[PDB]
Design a protein around this ligand. Sequence first.
Ligand code: CLA
Ligand code: CLA
Ligand code: CLA
Ligand code: CLA
Ligand SMILES: CC1=C(/C=C/C(C)=C/C=C/C(C)=C/C=C/C=C(C)/C=C/C=C(C)/C=C/C2=C(C)C[C@@H](O)CC2(C)C)C(C)(C)C[C@H](O)C1
Ligand SMILES: CC1=C(/C=C/C(C)=C/C=C/C(C)=C/C=C/C=C(C)/C=C/C=C(C)/C=C/C2=C(C)C[C@@H](O)CC2(C)C)C(C)(C)C[C@H](O)C1
Ligand SMILES: CC1=C(/C=C/C(C)=C/C=C/C(C)=C/C=C/C=C(C)/C=C/C=C(C)/C=C/C2=C(C)CCCC2(C)C)C(C)(C)CCC1
Ligand SMILES: CC1=C(/C=C/C(C)=C/C=C/C(C)=C/C=C/C=C(C)/C=C/C=C(C)/C=C/C2=C(C)CCCC2(C)C)C(C)(C)CCC1
Ligand code: SF4
Ligand code: SF4
Lengths: 84, 34, 80, 732, 162, 28, 177
Amino acid sequence: KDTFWTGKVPPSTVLGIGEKVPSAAYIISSVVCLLVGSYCVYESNLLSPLTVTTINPLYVLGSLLVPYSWGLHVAGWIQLKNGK
Amino acid sequence: MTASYLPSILVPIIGLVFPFISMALFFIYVEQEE
Amino acid sequence: AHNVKIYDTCIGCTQCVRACPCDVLEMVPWDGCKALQIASAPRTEDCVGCKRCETACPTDFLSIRVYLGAETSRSMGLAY
Amino acid sequence: VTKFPKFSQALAQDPTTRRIWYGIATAHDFESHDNITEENLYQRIFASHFGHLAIIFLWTSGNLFHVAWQGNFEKWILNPTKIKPIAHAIWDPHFGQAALKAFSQTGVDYPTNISYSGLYHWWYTIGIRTNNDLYLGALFLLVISGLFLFAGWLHLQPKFKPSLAWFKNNESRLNHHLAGLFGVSSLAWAGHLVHVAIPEARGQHVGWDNFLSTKPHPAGLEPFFKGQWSVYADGPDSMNHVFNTSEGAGKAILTFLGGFHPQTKSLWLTDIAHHHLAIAVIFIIAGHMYRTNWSIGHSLKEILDAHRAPGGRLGDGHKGLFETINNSLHFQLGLALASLGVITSLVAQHMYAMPSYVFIANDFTTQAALYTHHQYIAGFLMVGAFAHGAIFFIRDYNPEQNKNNVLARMLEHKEAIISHLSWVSLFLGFHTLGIYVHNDVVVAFGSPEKQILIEPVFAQWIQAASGKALYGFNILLSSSDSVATRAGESLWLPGWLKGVNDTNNSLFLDIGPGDFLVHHAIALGLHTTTLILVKGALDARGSKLMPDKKDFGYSFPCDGPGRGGTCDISAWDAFYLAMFWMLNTLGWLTFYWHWKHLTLWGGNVNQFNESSTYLMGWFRDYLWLNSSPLINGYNPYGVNNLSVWAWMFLFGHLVWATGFMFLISWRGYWQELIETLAWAHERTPLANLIKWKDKPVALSIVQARLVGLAHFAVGYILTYAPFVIASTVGKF
Amino acid sequence: SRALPFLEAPKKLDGKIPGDAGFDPLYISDNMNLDYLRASEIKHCRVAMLAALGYITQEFFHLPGDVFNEKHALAAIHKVPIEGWIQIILFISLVEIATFRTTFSFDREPGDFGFDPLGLAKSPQLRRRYQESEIRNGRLAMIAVIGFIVQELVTGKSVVEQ
Amino acid sequence: MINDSQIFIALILSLVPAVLALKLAREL
Amino acid sequence: LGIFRQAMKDFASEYPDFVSRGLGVTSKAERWNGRHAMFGLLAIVLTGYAKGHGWIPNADQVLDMQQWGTLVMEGFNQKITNERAIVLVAHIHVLLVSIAAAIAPFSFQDRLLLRPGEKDEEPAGLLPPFKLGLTKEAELWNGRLAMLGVTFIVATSIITGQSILDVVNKGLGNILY
Ligand code: CLA
Ligand code: CLA
Ligand code: CLA
Ligand code: CLA
Ligand SMILES: CC1=C(/C=C/C(C)=C/C=C/C(C)=C/C=C/C=C(C)/C=C/C=C(C)/C=C/C2=C(C)C[C@@H](O)CC2(C)C)C(C)(C)C[C@H](O)C1
Ligand SMILES: CC1=C(/C=C/C(C)=C/C=C/C(C)=C/C=C/C=C(C)/C=C/C=C(C)/C=C/C2=C(C)C[C@@H](O)CC2(C)C)C(C)(C)C[C@H](O)C1
Ligand SMILES: CC1=C(/C=C/C(C)=C/C=C/C(C)=C/C=C/C=C(C)/C=C/C=C(C)/C=C/C2=C(C)CCCC2(C)C)C(C)(C)CCC1
Ligand SMILES: CC1=C(/C=C/C(C)=C/C=C/C(C)=C/C=C/C=C(C)/C=C/C=C(C)/C=C/C2=C(C)CCCC2(C)C)C(C)(C)CCC1
Ligand code: SF4
Ligand code: SF4
């Protein structure tokens, strides 16, 4: 696949496995991932300092939803503007 | 034969023999007409 | 030997031929310019690569070009 | 025709001595050789790489072997801050008895060289304790050398030569190099530390004999598989731990203490083990990015083609770059050299500030040697990166296939780039030199209070942000109330802040107006070196003076005296000029590092703080003052152990100055002189029996520049190395 | 493929050569020189089989003298005389140097060094049966001997005792 | 510490890279 | 023979220039090295006898650096003994004969290298022809056997940890010393 594109909007095929996913699915999931991820970071690090005996694996895993939410909102915009 | 003899045997060979054989071989190589 | 090439912007002024100290070049008939002649390089085995020809050439960019190449006793200018 | 060089008929037919010189100088430029194919090229490069790896492993083997056999490692580990480590024995029949005695003062009964490489410190840290440990190491690396050598031979045999497609499988190579070469290597090193280095540090022998039966931690892997990983952090080495003993020793194998072990003045081994385990995970994950044989993952070509900013400011973006890079070994080598050049500098900077090897912070000469070594290597790598960038533009760049991508748009505004680099270099130059000269004149006339002394407040603020309290900026880690301070207070911050705020280490040195001026000097050096190299690369294909330069190649003498004269017009000539600037810049920064440390270690920081703001201070208090031990290595009254450095110092001056002959006097003078010598030989009786096979000629125009630069550079290093070593040995 | 009957076998493995069950899920054969790999497998087979036989026998039976009376195989290494080991190494060395040319020539057939003293593989059809079974016993022995060694390291007991 | 025997073993082993280097050199 | 004949061709292909001058895997080199090995074992035997019977004067005495200079020094601040220096001098005699013989040979003698267009002697094989007397055969028989002897004696010393002289002396039945 040639992924080169012109104009203002990429053509959905840049999303790979997620090319057929609807715009609303991406947009809602991006908000959820950002809020849950932000909460994990807050609970882990900001609500009381992190200690050697207070590392929750779920909060560490959950923190990865913050960068993931970025990707989801870019994909959401791409689908929105492509009509999907 | 012991190990403390080795510098006195080897250093003259690496310094005064190996280089001059190498120089001689390289000289013969670069002058060959073939 | 050095490569000498003459490009089609030549105006047949003869200055390169006059400049050359090894008689590499000569003027031959041509239709392409008002002077009705072009420079030619039939004897590049005698070219020393001094580039006096290029210094002499009035066109912009040059119409004669010397590409220095495989050295010989001739090209290195040896009298020994 | 004289066969050598077999790879170039053009050279082989040359009847002069130039044939031999140019044969040697073009032997590794495989692309230029007669009848080279793209496949043969990659195969020959691959085999050459195996040869190079073998040489690295033989060199390491030799270091281990010589220390095992002739060193004093076993004695040194009993008193590391007092005993001098031995590099190897001396056997030199030119020595007189007085020199034998001078070099036989290191405990042992035979002349030796002291090591400044830091190998003893390294090996002791990582768990080596005996000459038998070293010896087996040496034996092992002999075998690895041979293995690579064999693989080199094997991969040139018909049925084992890899295909061109194998060599351009970018995704597979990246997956394996990230996850395997980096990731697993890092994981295995964390294994070594946990199983061997850390026990040995706590007085326990662990070796091949007992390691299968000796658990790194009493709990074993039970906590690991139950996710009770905090067990491995409990019970760190106390602050009273005596290295290589059980006194004060802990049980923890993984920690995040921060800062330094108080005794060894080096990073905690349990922190280092945990560092390596953590990055191993990241590298292994990173190496699952690219698509190989199972459909998941990314194509590099697809990523590149898609990265165009939609607003159009980057044109067509990265379209075409995949092919450009994939078909150019020079592009790839330039990327590799640049990246490695940055990393080598980072090693120099981080190893002086945050040493990992026990007692190395006490070995001042070693610290100085190691910093200077790595910064010089980095300098060379950076120049090479740009050299190969220029070579790329001539040999491999296809304008058609890069139209309006980010690479093509660099060429489109090359005058803007070059003219701005020119401006910034002039701006830094005029003002930095100007302030230094203001300061010199005003101090010379007896008014140091008239000096312009700018506090480096931005750098001091960055120190404060990492928790340096001295300046009172009350920002981030230097404020108690900050969220940054709160977040790390139960983890690394206690250990880190102690190290930062300790004045008797190199972790965030105090900085003042002296440090301000020399940083702008360094900035001048970086910008100007870059100017020369960038102008080299961007004008490599052509200029107004020579619009068809790409037709002449990377290196050529000139284009003759027409059009005003064209000496040094090639892109190679930019490399040559940049080398002088790289050496200058490295001079300034290594002088800086060394003087800053001489005065720190000597307990007279005020000397640096007051003398460094005017140039006579450097000349007098650095160069002139510290030369004294060196130049007295030998004198009319006798010799000491600095004799060899004294001699090398003068050797460096001689080689440097000989370079000036080649750089200043140019070819035509010499060719006329050699003619008269050819005449004399042929007309001298007896002598004229003997006849040359190769007609003697003066070196070529480019050859002179290269030989001059080689002498200049070798002389530069062989002058500075003895000074930096003997200065420090002489003082401490 | 056969061994993995849901996957397809790689292109190189057609099912003609001895030992071919189409077992190469990673598709190593696509990149690797197969002729040499076959020679390498057969070599590991033959070394493992001798090693497997050696392990079980020298537990029970013993060469005369106190030096060669160690029931534990891994403990026997340090007891046996060095000069004894040098002779075995020099012997193995001479064989490997003699065979080196054939191995990298790829003229003869993998594992074939013209060693049939008794002339057991007279017929080509018998040779085929023997060649498959060599690999089968060899593959089995390769796992087993690694089984034996690891078991000794873990427990500290000779194969029969444990 | 290190014996004559150990130094001779090293020298003998160093012939392996020596010979192989010769082979690689020639093949290149 | 097929293994050996092929091995010779392989070496000749790799090194044509050397093999053409009789250097390397050649019958020329086999014979010459045989001659040196035969002389060599005599020299070892004579050394063992001379040491035993006390022919070398002040054998264990160390040389002075003032008289003999810096070359007396060894690796670990050890000095060369008189015995070792003397044995070296004995070899220097025959090394200088060798150099003379190689560069300026007798008209009749066997030369070191092959002539411009001289072929090698045909390989003897696993067993040469058994011809008693001063023959090329008998020379090659004794040369091969001597070189085997040197290989064995050296190998024995490192493996067992005994001195070459001790191995040779015990091999002859404690006759030399
Ligand atoms: C302004 C910055 C910017 C913008 C607007 C874009 C825009 C785009 N990028 Mg680019 N990208 C950028 C910066 C940017 N990029 C940077 C800095 C990098 C790293 C060098 C990349 C690396 C990158 C890659 C590798 C790819 C893109 C792709 C794209 C396109 C599709 C995006 C998508 O599919 O989202 C949807 C993405 C997701 C839903 C995934 C979330 C993001 C990751 C997974 C988070 C990281 C998580 C963690 C580290 C990994 C998991 C660990 C563990 C669980 C195993 C889109 C045009 C795609 C493309 O070009 O198609 C051909 C594509 O394949 N980008
Ligand atoms: C991985 C690193 C690497 C690799 C693989 C290459 C590979 C190559 N380089 Mg690049 N290069 C590199 C790093 C590298 N370089 C670095 C770090 C620099 C900056 C110095 C350069 C600068 C550079 C330039 C300017 C050029 C190359 C060229 C080349 C090509 C071969 C030239 C040749 O035949 O060399 C043969 C080299 C020599 C014969 C020089 C001898 C060694 C020097 C002078 C040091 C002498 C030290 C002296 C002996 C010590 C004295 C000791 C004292 C005590 C007496 C080859 C493709 C050339 C090319 O042709 O590309 C088109 C070319 O013009 N390179
Ligand atoms: C001390 C030695 C020295 C000095 C002072 C210079 C200075 C300069 N070099 Mg040069 N260079 C040097 C050695 C030196 N180089 C060597 C050994 C080489 C190897 C051949 C080079 C190769 C080189 C290259 C390839 C380049 C430079 C460039 C520069 C300029 C860099 C920017 C700058 O600092 O502007 C500030 C200017 C100065 C510091 C110059 C001196 C200003 C004086 C002190 C003003 C005095 C005025 C005062 C009234 C007195 C008047 C005197 C009276 C008789 C009229 C600067 C003019 C670069 C450039 O031109 O960038 C734009 C450039 O590309 N240099
Ligand atoms: C230190 C710097 C240096 C050195 C050593 C040289 C050396 C030389 N110059 Mg040069 N010159 C220099 C700087 C230098 N120059 C500079 C900066 C310029 C630019 C202006 C010139 C421009 C120049 C011109 C225009 C001319 C010279 C000439 C000479 C030669 C004079 C004859 C002579 O003395 O032979 C004897 C050689 C020496 C004294 C050099 C050192 C000898 C050492 C100490 C002894 C030998 C050591 C030993 C054998 C080493 C073996 C080691 C090896 C086996 C590993 C001599 C080779 C002239 C010439 O060619 O005369 C015929 C000549 O016309 N030079
Ligand atoms: C003593 C001494 C002296 C005499 C010195 C003297 C000359 C020493 C001579 C020793 C000789 C040369 C050893 C030779 C031993 C040669 C070995 C044993 C060859 C092994 C070959 C194998 C077997 C090939 C394997 C093959 C491989 C490669 C390839 C394949 O084709 C298969 C085969 C085909 C098998 C003096 C004069 C200096 C005085 C001093 O005072 C005392
Ligand atoms: C079981 C056996 C083993 C080896 C068996 C054993 C050790 C074989 C070794 C034999 C010996 C030691 C060398 C004997 C050969 C030495 C003789 C031939 C020397 C002749 C000297 C000359 C001819 C005279 C000198 C002259 C004299 C007249 C006086 C001088 O003035 C002049 C010259 C002109 C120099 C294995 C384990 C390796 C395996 C192999 O499978 C079989
Ligand atoms: C037999 C014997 C012996 C002997 C010994 C000896 C005599 C030794 C020696 C040794 C030696 C004498 C060694 C050496 C070594 C060397 C080496 C190891 C080298 C290497 C090199 C390289 C690695 C190179 C590479 C390269 C180059 C540089 C160029 C081109 C490319 C290449 C890559 C190829 C004895 C008596 C003990 C006894 C037993 C047996
Ligand atoms: C010419 C050319 C070339 C070359 C080039 C080069 C040589 C370059 C270089 C370059 C370089 C040499 C660069 C560098 C850079 C760097 C950077 C870019 C950095 C960054 C950084 C950052 C981002 C940071 C961050 C941070 C953190 C992380 C933490 C702390 C804080 C801070 C902020 C610091 C090539 C081959 C391409 C080809 C084409 C042409
Ligand atoms: S380079 Fe010189 S010799 Fe050659 S054609 Fe031009 S003028 Fe004539
Ligand atoms: S000097 Fe230039 S324009 Fe004139 S004749 Fe020569 S090539 Fe033509």
